[PDB]
């Protein structure tokens, strides 16, 4: 297990400094980084594991219309730090993270070209794999919704985490 450490503090936003009396805490945020994935069934929630049928893709537009579809993080242009903090003794095998890109086309790689790999870290050796904080560039000239799709796969068991964050990336 683990949780998002940076950018920002969402706890600070929930706090009375929002003004003094009002708030927009988005309290669905208790454990979203730790969104589990299981091989086989059950899932408790609705079906996941649907990537080869693309039920979790073409049908996953409904997941981008879900009650559980928590909030867009607003980021202006330039690089930002993205850091996760963990309580894991668990052995990762690999983690990698993508953004969606708008405007897919069936005549083209659509189930891959839905996205862009924005970074990857395999479990291998050196302080390169040890890095748990990474800096990602945000274009300075564009505005638009994206989802970060991230996977954090575990060597220790056939089950993993698979997690998403909606964002709204904008200009400098
Ligand atoms: Cu855990």
PDB file of C-alpha atoms and ligand atoms in Angstrom:
ATOM      1  CA  UNK A   1       0.000   0.000   0.000  1.00  0.00           C
ATOM      2  CA  UNK A   2       0.767   3.648  -0.508  1.00  0.00           C
ATOM      3  CA  UNK A   3      -0.633   7.185  -1.340  1.00  0.00           C
ATOM      4  CA  UNK A   4       0.067  10.312  -3.402  1.00  0.00           C
ATOM      5  CA  UNK A   5       2.563  12.706  -1.776  1.00  0.00           C
ATOM      6  CA  UNK A   6       3.006  15.408  -4.432  1.00  0.00           C
ATOM      7  CA  UNK A   7       2.003  17.649  -6.260  1.00  0.00           C
ATOM      8  CA  UNK A   8       0.277  19.687  -3.663  1.00  0.00           C
ATOM      9  CA  UNK A   9      -1.789  18.663  -0.527  1.00  0.00           C
ATOM     10  CA  UNK A  10      -5.368  17.870  -0.900  1.00  0.00           C
ATOM     11  CA  UNK A  11      -5.706  17.807   2.843  1.00  0.00           C
ATOM     12  CA  UNK A  12      -4.730  21.484   2.884  1.00  0.00           C
ATOM     13  CA  UNK A  13      -7.511  22.167   0.461  1.00  0.00           C
ATOM     14  CA  UNK A  14     -10.064  20.422   2.679  1.00  0.00           C
ATOM     15  CA  UNK A  15      -8.876  22.471   5.662  1.00  0.00           C
ATOM     16  CA  UNK A  16     -10.503  25.714   6.810  1.00  0.00           C
ATOM     17  CA  UNK A  17      -7.913  27.777   4.868  1.00  0.00           C
ATOM     18  CA  UNK A  18     -10.099  27.155   1.776  1.00  0.00           C
ATOM     19  CA  UNK A  19     -11.529  30.406   3.144  1.00  0.00           C
ATOM     20  CA  UNK A  20     -12.638  30.028   6.795  1.00  0.00           C
ATOM     21  CA  UNK A  21     -16.029  28.301   6.459  1.00  0.00           C
ATOM     22  CA  UNK A  22     -16.640  26.618   3.120  1.00  0.00           C
ATOM     23  CA  UNK A  23     -14.972  23.632   1.467  1.00  0.00           C
ATOM     24  CA  UNK A  24     -14.969  21.177  -1.475  1.00  0.00           C
ATOM     25  CA  UNK A  25     -13.032  18.354   0.047  1.00  0.00           C
ATOM     26  CA  UNK A  26     -13.753  15.554  -2.402  1.00  0.00           C
ATOM     27  CA  UNK A  27     -13.727  13.049   0.462  1.00  0.00           C
ATOM     28  CA  UNK A  28     -13.851  10.004  -2.089  1.00  0.00           C
ATOM     29  CA  UNK A  29     -10.060  10.529  -1.987  1.00  0.00           C
ATOM     30  CA  UNK A  30      -9.353   8.229   0.946  1.00  0.00           C
ATOM     31  CA  UNK A  31      -7.367   5.458  -1.004  1.00  0.00           C
ATOM     32  CA  UNK A  32      -7.293   6.053  -4.674  1.00  0.00           C
ATOM     33  CA  UNK A  33      -3.638   5.401  -5.360  1.00  0.00           C
ATOM     34  CA  UNK A  34      -4.140   2.008  -3.771  1.00  0.00           C
ATOM     35  CA  UNK A  35      -6.802   0.894  -6.299  1.00  0.00           C
ATOM     36  CA  UNK A  36      -6.327  -2.835  -6.423  1.00  0.00           C
ATOM     37  CA  UNK A  37      -6.450  -5.153  -9.443  1.00  0.00           C
ATOM     38  CA  UNK A  38      -7.082  -8.921  -9.154  1.00  0.00           C
ATOM     39  CA  UNK A  39      -6.602 -11.749 -11.633  1.00  0.00           C
ATOM     40  CA  UNK A  40      -9.723 -13.911 -11.908  1.00  0.00           C
ATOM     41  CA  UNK A  41     -12.662 -12.698  -9.872  1.00  0.00           C
ATOM     42  CA  UNK A  42     -14.249 -11.351  -7.693  1.00  0.00           C
ATOM     43  CA  UNK A  43     -13.639  -7.565  -8.003  1.00  0.00           C
ATOM     44  CA  UNK A  44     -16.254  -6.325  -5.425  1.00  0.00           C
ATOM     45  CA  UNK A  45     -16.766  -3.229  -7.676  1.00  0.00           C
ATOM     46  CA  UNK A  46     -17.661  -3.478 -11.344  1.00  0.00           C
ATOM     47  CA  UNK A  47     -15.543  -5.531 -13.821  1.00  0.00           C
ATOM     48  CA  UNK A  48     -11.934  -4.535 -14.405  1.00  0.00           C
ATOM     49  CA  UNK A  49      -9.519  -6.891 -16.162  1.00  0.00           C
ATOM     50  CA  UNK A  50     -11.248  -6.063 -19.345  1.00  0.00           C
ATOM     51  CA  UNK A  51      -8.394  -4.559 -21.323  1.00  0.00           C
ATOM     52  CA  UNK A  52      -8.070  -7.274 -24.098  1.00  0.00           C
ATOM     53  CA  UNK A  53     -11.842  -7.206 -24.762  1.00  0.00           C
ATOM     54  CA  UNK A  54     -11.481  -3.414 -24.417  1.00  0.00           C
ATOM     55  CA  UNK A  55     -14.546  -3.521 -22.220  1.00  0.00           C
ATOM     56  CA  UNK A  56     -12.382  -1.495 -19.858  1.00  0.00           C
ATOM     57  CA  UNK A  57     -11.493   0.850 -22.775  1.00  0.00           C
ATOM     58  CA  UNK A  58     -14.292   1.562 -25.297  1.00  0.00           C
ATOM     59  CA  UNK A  59     -16.663   0.658 -22.504  1.00  0.00           C
ATOM     60  CA  UNK A  60     -14.448   2.509 -20.086  1.00  0.00           C
ATOM     61  CA  UNK A  61     -15.869   5.722 -21.303  1.00  0.00           C
ATOM     62  CA  UNK A  62     -18.593   4.911 -18.869  1.00  0.00           C
ATOM     63  CA  UNK A  63     -15.939   4.675 -16.151  1.00  0.00           C
ATOM     64  CA  UNK A  64     -14.993   8.221 -17.156  1.00  0.00           C
ATOM     65  CA  UNK A  65     -18.657   8.931 -16.404  1.00  0.00           C
ATOM     66  CA  UNK A  66     -18.677   7.099 -13.080  1.00  0.00           C
ATOM     67  CA  UNK A  67     -19.777   8.380  -9.624  1.00  0.00           C
ATOM     68  CA  UNK A  68     -16.254   7.333  -8.526  1.00  0.00           C
ATOM     69  CA  UNK A  69     -14.632   9.614 -11.124  1.00  0.00           C
ATOM     70  CA  UNK A  70     -12.890  11.947  -8.856  1.00  0.00           C
ATOM     71  CA  UNK A  71     -11.624  15.281  -9.487  1.00  0.00           C
ATOM     72  CA  UNK A  72      -9.404  16.846 -12.143  1.00  0.00           C
ATOM     73  CA  UNK A  73      -6.139  18.082 -10.712  1.00  0.00           C
ATOM     74  CA  UNK A  74      -5.301  21.451 -12.258  1.00  0.00           C
ATOM     75  CA  UNK A  75      -1.688  21.841 -13.327  1.00  0.00           C
ATOM     76  CA  UNK A  76      -0.271  24.824 -15.262  1.00  0.00           C
ATOM     77  CA  UNK A  77       2.607  24.414 -17.685  1.00  0.00           C
ATOM     78  CA  UNK A  78       6.134  23.527 -16.865  1.00  0.00           C
ATOM     79  CA  UNK A  79       7.566  20.487 -15.037  1.00  0.00           C
ATOM     80  CA  UNK A  80       5.985  19.375 -11.777  1.00  0.00           C
ATOM     81  CA  UNK A  81       7.171  16.775  -9.281  1.00  0.00           C
ATOM     82  CA  UNK A  82       5.059  13.645  -8.957  1.00  0.00           C
ATOM     83  CA  UNK A  83       5.863  11.646  -5.832  1.00  0.00           C
ATOM     84  CA  UNK A  84       4.202   8.698  -4.192  1.00  0.00           C
ATOM     85  CA  UNK A  85       4.871   7.532  -0.666  1.00  0.00           C
ATOM     86  CA  UNK A  86       4.525   3.896   0.351  1.00  0.00           C
ATOM     87  CA  UNK A  87       4.227   1.673   3.501  1.00  0.00           C
ATOM     88  CA  UNK A  88       5.089  -1.289   1.260  1.00  0.00           C
ATOM     89  CA  UNK A  89       7.514  -4.030   2.126  1.00  0.00           C
ATOM     90  CA  UNK A  90       6.057  -5.418  -1.088  1.00  0.00           C
ATOM     91  CA  UNK A  91       8.386  -6.149  -4.022  1.00  0.00           C
ATOM     92  CA  UNK A  92       7.382  -4.209  -7.165  1.00  0.00           C
ATOM     93  CA  UNK A  93       8.105  -5.759 -10.496  1.00  0.00           C
ATOM     94  CA  UNK A  94       7.321  -2.700 -12.569  1.00  0.00           C
ATOM     95  CA  UNK A  95       5.532   0.538 -12.586  1.00  0.00           C
ATOM     96  CA  UNK A  96       4.752   2.791 -15.502  1.00  0.00           C
ATOM     97  CA  UNK A  97       2.385   5.730 -16.095  1.00  0.00           C
ATOM     98  CA  UNK A  98       0.629   7.149 -19.135  1.00  0.00           C
ATOM     99  CA  UNK A  99      -1.695  10.060 -19.975  1.00  0.00           C
ATOM    100  CA  UNK A 100      -4.647   9.774 -22.314  1.00  0.00           C
ATOM    101  CA  UNK A 101      -4.644  11.803 -25.486  1.00  0.00           C
ATOM    102  CA  UNK A 102      -7.984  13.120 -27.013  1.00  0.00           C
ATOM    103  CA  UNK A 103      -9.004  12.386 -30.647  1.00  0.00           C
ATOM    104  CA  UNK A 104      -8.480   8.646 -31.306  1.00  0.00           C
ATOM    105  CA  UNK A 105      -9.152   7.098 -34.765  1.00  0.00           C
ATOM    106  CA  UNK A 106     -10.226   3.553 -35.677  1.00  0.00           C
ATOM    107  CA  UNK A 107      -8.171   3.560 -38.863  1.00  0.00           C
ATOM    108  CA  UNK A 108      -5.076   3.900 -36.663  1.00  0.00           C
ATOM    109  CA  UNK A 109      -3.724   2.220 -33.364  1.00  0.00           C
ATOM    110  CA  UNK A 110      -6.608   3.408 -31.222  1.00  0.00           C
ATOM    111  CA  UNK A 111      -6.221   0.837 -28.232  1.00  0.00           C
ATOM    112  CA  UNK A 112      -2.605   1.938 -27.950  1.00  0.00           C
ATOM    113  CA  UNK A 113      -2.749   5.320 -29.391  1.00  0.00           C
ATOM    114  CA  UNK A 114      -5.334   6.188 -26.781  1.00  0.00           C
ATOM    115  CA  UNK A 115      -2.330   7.165 -24.758  1.00  0.00           C
ATOM    116  CA  UNK A 116       1.274   8.359 -24.359  1.00  0.00           C
ATOM    117  CA  UNK A 117       3.807   6.620 -21.999  1.00  0.00           C
ATOM    118  CA  UNK A 118       4.985   9.598 -19.885  1.00  0.00           C
ATOM    119  CA  UNK A 119       7.406   7.437 -17.869  1.00  0.00           C
ATOM    120  CA  UNK A 120       8.396   3.919 -16.846  1.00  0.00           C
ATOM    121  CA  UNK A 121      10.419   2.362 -14.013  1.00  0.00           C
ATOM    122  CA  UNK A 122      11.212  -1.416 -13.903  1.00  0.00           C
ATOM    123  CA  UNK A 123      12.515  -3.047 -10.755  1.00  0.00           C
ATOM    124  CA  UNK A 124      16.116  -3.611 -11.578  1.00  0.00           C
ATOM    125  CA  UNK A 125      18.924  -2.034  -9.636  1.00  0.00           C
ATOM    126  CA  UNK A 126      20.694   1.386  -9.161  1.00  0.00           C
ATOM    127  CA  UNK A 127      19.229   4.655  -7.920  1.00  0.00           C
ATOM    128  CA  UNK A 128      17.351   4.936 -11.181  1.00  0.00           C
ATOM    129  CA  UNK A 129      14.934   2.188 -10.258  1.00  0.00           C
ATOM    130  CA  UNK A 130      14.904   3.429  -6.625  1.00  0.00           C
ATOM    131  CA  UNK A 131      13.580   6.779  -7.705  1.00  0.00           C
ATOM    132  CA  UNK A 132      10.007   7.189  -6.407  1.00  0.00           C
ATOM    133  CA  UNK A 133       9.851  10.909  -7.269  1.00  0.00           C
ATOM    134  CA  UNK A 134       9.940  11.979 -10.944  1.00  0.00           C
ATOM    135  CA  UNK A 135       9.498  15.254 -12.787  1.00  0.00           C
ATOM    136  CA  UNK A 136       7.063  15.394 -15.751  1.00  0.00           C
ATOM    137  CA  UNK A 137       6.766  18.272 -18.272  1.00  0.00           C
ATOM    138  CA  UNK A 138       3.365  19.795 -18.872  1.00  0.00           C
ATOM    139  CA  UNK A 139       3.009  21.789 -22.137  1.00  0.00           C
ATOM    140  CA  UNK A 140       2.898  25.461 -21.712  1.00  0.00           C
ATOM    141  CA  UNK A 141       0.679  26.205 -24.698  1.00  0.00           C
ATOM    142  CA  UNK A 142      -2.171  23.649 -24.387  1.00  0.00           C
ATOM    143  CA  UNK A 143      -5.361  23.272 -22.242  1.00  0.00           C
ATOM    144  CA  UNK A 144      -7.283  20.098 -21.783  1.00  0.00           C
ATOM    145  CA  UNK A 145      -8.534  17.166 -19.853  1.00  0.00           C
ATOM    146  CA  UNK A 146      -6.437  13.978 -19.727  1.00  0.00           C
ATOM    147  CA  UNK A 147      -6.475  11.006 -17.274  1.00  0.00           C
ATOM    148  CA  UNK A 148      -3.180   9.679 -15.882  1.00  0.00           C
ATOM    149  CA  UNK A 149      -3.359   5.846 -16.202  1.00  0.00           C
ATOM    150  CA  UNK A 150      -0.750   4.209 -13.979  1.00  0.00           C
ATOM    151  CA  UNK A 151       0.138   0.607 -13.239  1.00  0.00           C
ATOM    152  CA  UNK A 152       2.112  -0.640 -10.138  1.00  0.00           C
ATOM    153  CA  UNK A 153       2.650  -4.347 -10.536  1.00  0.00           C
ATOM    154  CA  UNK A 154       3.841  -6.578  -7.730  1.00  0.00           C
ATOM    155  CA  UNK A 155       6.331  -9.426  -8.081  1.00  0.00           C
ATOM    156  CA  UNK A 156       5.176 -11.041  -4.881  1.00  0.00           C
ATOM    157  CA  UNK A 157       1.695 -12.016  -6.006  1.00  0.00           C
ATOM    158  CA  UNK A 158      -0.290 -12.339  -9.306  1.00  0.00           C
ATOM    159  CA  UNK A 159      -2.483  -9.395  -8.183  1.00  0.00           C
ATOM    160  CA  UNK A 160      -1.435  -5.687  -8.535  1.00  0.00           C
ATOM    161  CA  UNK A 161      -2.566  -2.035  -8.288  1.00  0.00           C
ATOM    162  CA  UNK A 162      -3.915  -0.167 -11.322  1.00  0.00           C
ATOM    163  CA  UNK A 163      -4.825   3.426 -10.627  1.00  0.00           C
ATOM    164  CA  UNK A 164      -6.115   6.509 -12.418  1.00  0.00           C
ATOM    165  CA  UNK A 165      -6.103  10.295 -11.751  1.00  0.00           C
ATOM    166  CA  UNK A 166      -8.156  12.748 -13.808  1.00  0.00           C
ATOM    167  CA  UNK A 167      -6.324  16.010 -14.563  1.00  0.00           C
ATOM    168  CA  UNK A 168      -6.775  19.255 -16.353  1.00  0.00           C
ATOM    169  CA  UNK A 169      -3.479  20.324 -17.805  1.00  0.00           C
ATOM    170  CA  UNK A 170      -3.267  23.954 -18.954  1.00  0.00           C
ATOM    171  CA  UNK A 171      -1.021  26.720 -20.177  1.00  0.00           C
ATOM    172  CA  UNK A 172       1.840  28.501 -18.420  1.00  0.00           C
TER     173      UNK A 172
HETATM  174 CU1  LIG B   1       0.090  -3.301   0.689  1.00  0.00          CU
END
